Amino acid sequence: HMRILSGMRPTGKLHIGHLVGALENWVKLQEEGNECFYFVADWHALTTHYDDVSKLKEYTRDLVRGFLACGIDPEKSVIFVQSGVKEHAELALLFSMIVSVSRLERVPTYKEIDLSTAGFLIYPVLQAADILIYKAEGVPVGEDQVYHIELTREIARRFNYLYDEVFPEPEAILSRVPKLPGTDGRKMSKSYGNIINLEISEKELEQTILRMMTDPARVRRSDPGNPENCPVWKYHQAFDISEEESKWVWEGCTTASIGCVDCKKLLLKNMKRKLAPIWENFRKIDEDPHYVDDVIMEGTKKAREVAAKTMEEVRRAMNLMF
Amino acid sequence: HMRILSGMRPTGKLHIGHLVGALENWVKLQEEGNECFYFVADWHALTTHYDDVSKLKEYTRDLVRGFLACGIDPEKSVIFVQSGVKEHAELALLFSMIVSVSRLERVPTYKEIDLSTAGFLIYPVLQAADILIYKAEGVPVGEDQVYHIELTREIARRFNYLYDEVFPEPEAILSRVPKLPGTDGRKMSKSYGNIINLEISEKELEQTILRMMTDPARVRRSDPGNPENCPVWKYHQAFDISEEESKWVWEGCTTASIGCVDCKKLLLKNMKRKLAPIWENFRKIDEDPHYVDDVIMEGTKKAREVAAKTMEEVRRAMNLMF
Ligand SMILES: N[C@@H](Cc1c[nH]c2ccccc12)C(=O)O
Ligand SMILES: N[C@@H](Cc1c[nH]c2ccccc12)C(=O)O
Ligand code: SF4
Ligand code: SF4
């Protein structure tokens, strides 16, 4: 029974990849009954997108609207916006005084990802503030983000040592969910036009699935394919294909006894099954205008009072006046 | 008629050097009737002294007590503590997103002054926040600190350009006051035991002045000296030696017709003249316990409301939700 913390940067409309990776895990942690703190990391959006803020406020709200459509329940999780919890800035600043420049340079997520800014360098320090300010015990993350969890633990340890013992050492909760490719085999990116937004229509989903990439081995209908080399098959898994349906595809495809059209019809049925409730939810949320604003203010108010309680300790430990 | 901003790090009891350099200029700017914002930079104390915070809160208060004893009047200046104005942390963080790592590395005050920390690198960004958050027009500084004013102007310009025009470009107000050496010729440092605290007693001042270094040329009483090579002479200037008294010293010393004892008796009279009111003031302040706490809360409350007004603009310009 745990204190979970996680966040997402508002960079746009949420797609299939945010859902089957991150958000489903978030909802699973929520339903298992842990104390979940989930937020829109709007200040992290600035570390990389300080050149285009024209849609930041708007994307921030949309991200919260999306969390909600996907099952993030504010009656049981704390949902908030990073920029509203001013205490994160203060802790980030305070932690920056105990972390070396070289240590931030070693971060792989750094040198791998304009971005020559002080802000991008201390990104992980801010991320440590986000996690440690709610004294989180678990942080759901994909293998890619593990290095930021290790630093946070170091920060916690160096802090507890130099001052007083205030912070638990948080641990990563790794996703088993495999990364989903784009609708055309390659990685998901907006520039490749291979993305599927959660808020797509049935006609547009129907058309995106039908022109989707299949195993290039199947030049003709009579040519058998190999689902391991097929994006459609990868999508079948993300959308809860039954043991029966998967034997049908596998034996169908490999024996060249089903056509990809039929195979995609099955993905459509299953992916529409997962999306229909999310689509309904987007409609229910919009009919109560202010529902999302109310959720944001209430949620951020709650995150704030937890954060403030932690800062009282932090300031007392560092012997600061205020 | 201007908006003046400046601060000092609480590193200890204030001495002669804080008074005749920085504080006298502060009081002069105050008396000329400018809008002065003066504060204890307790977070900057952490950039260098994160290893010894045991006396931080205590030194912070003492620094404010000292500002007051020296004539910083809260009925006309805004006196506050940096850590109490949380908005500084937020602006610092926001400015860090628009300043390069290399630009912070170029800062001479950096590579010239443990200190391998992220916090020490972004020190000037925090200092830009301190200055630009009150939209200051003038910042009193010694030649040494000029480079931090130039960066702040760059930050302001890059911000106004990328977002909306929120900040004036502040300018440095350079001290004419020459640096005062220690009581033994060399630079002032606590490790050389050549410092004179403002809160010294008459007996201790009397004794510190009498054993003070004189021109080594005066081996004997009959040997003339050269006041330009004498620390006592340098102190005479900081303590408002009259044209008459200075002709007496100069002709006395160079003609070997006065003795250093007599010369120091004159420094004593004059330095005691400047210190007696400050000493009385320390007594008047202490008889009203809470006077300093009241001043700190009232002052910081006032700095906060100005700072918050500036942040509303900053957040609106960067299109952040909160
Ligand atoms: N940009 C970060 C956002 C973030 C900040 N703090 C976090 C804590 C946990 C997870 C994510 C975060 C990310 O995508 O990971
Ligand atoms: N350490 C800085 C303190 C400071 C922060 N902001 C400032 C603005 C003006 C003057 C001083 C400051 C200094 O001594 O200069
Ligand atoms: S039958 Fe299905 S798994 Fe096989 S290549 Fe076609 S779309 Fe892909
Ligand atoms: S007479 Fe005065 S100025 Fe000359 S060496 Fe002595 S103390 Fe110094």
Residue numbers in the entry:
A (entry chain A), B (entry chain A): 0 to 112, 120 to 328
Structure paper excerpt:
Class I AARSs are mostly monomeric and contain a classic Rossmann nucleotide-fold catalytic domain and two highly conserved sequence motifs ‘HIGH’ and ‘KMSKS’ that are critical for their function.
The final model contains one TmTrpRS molecule (residues 0–328), one iron–sulfur cluster [4Fe–4S], one tryptophan and 56 water molecules in the asymmetric unit. The N-terminal catalytic domain adopts a canonical Rossmann nucleotide-binding fold (residues 1–181 and 296–328) with a central, five-stranded, parallel β-sheet (β1–β5; the strand order is 32145) and a tRNA anticodon-binding domain that adopts an all-helical fold (residues 187–294). The TAB domain is composed of four α-helices (α11–α14) and two 310 helices (η3 and η4) that are packed as a bundle. Remarkably, the structure of TmTrpRS differs from other TrpRS by the presence of an iron–sulfur cluster [4Fe–4S] in the C-terminal TAB domain. In the TmTrpRS structure, which is similar to the ‘open’ conformation of BsTrpRS, the KMSKS motif is further from the ATP site and is not poised to bind ATP. Accordingly, no ATP molecule was observed in the crystal. Although a single molecule is present in the asymmetric unit, crystal-packing analysis identified a crystallographic dimer that is likely to represent the biologically relevant dimer. In the case of the [4Fe–4S] cluster in TmTrpRS, we believe that it plays a role in the recognition of specifically modified tRNA; however, the biological implications of this are unknown at present.
